[PDB]
Design a protein around this ligand. Sequence first.
Ligand code: HEM
Length: 212
Amino acid sequence: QDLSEALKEATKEVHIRAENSEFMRNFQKGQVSREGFKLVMASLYHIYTALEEEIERNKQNPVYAPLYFPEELHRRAALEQDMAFWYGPHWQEAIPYTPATQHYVKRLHEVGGTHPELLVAHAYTRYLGDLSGGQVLKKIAQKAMALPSSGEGLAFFTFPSIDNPTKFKQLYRARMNTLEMTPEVKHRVTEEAKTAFLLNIELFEELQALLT
Ligand code: HEM
């Protein structure tokens, strides 16, 4: 069984749970505030910073390298633009770094530094969602918060180097399927993808509490 399929299958249940977190349920209904949106986007800034630091560390490592697509996929620059938009020019000392965000970052560094063969789980969980469902979330955000089609404040959700998210997704999955796989690696990769998803749920839980 192909890795791309094994991951989709292993995470379909937890994905249902993630969409139904209180924060995402409210987000999807069009009830996201600037305060709530700023918190989540600041937390992603930290998460994608860590993810992409570890990607760069492992770019030549054959357990990751076939997924090395910085120009197309990396979000850190986009998130910096969004931070300047939402938080102003002194955003680096305005933005929060919540405990659940720190916890996700920690696991990202553990994976990148000690278990790089699992980094694909984390890239899969974030980037493939951003290319799929994130495009729906973009539209809802834009409408909720009166964000302009010209894209300011939603750079995260915009992939100017990818013509067509569906075709790129199909390429990315094809390339995942070229990673050297043993039963050991495959089983732990799909476990770590479930952990990535839980880390996200835990963040959304935390943000919702901080908002109430
Ligand atoms: C309200 C919240 C969300 C909505 C409405 C949403 C919606 C979607 C939609 C419509 C797809 C495409 C499904 C398909 O192609 O059959 C998708 C795929 C994906 N989503 Fe989300 N999603 C949400 C939250 C999340 C979160 C929180 C994560 C991860 C942290 C995530 C990760 C993914 C991944 C990895 C895929 C790719 C599945 C695959 O093709 O293997 N989703 N989601």
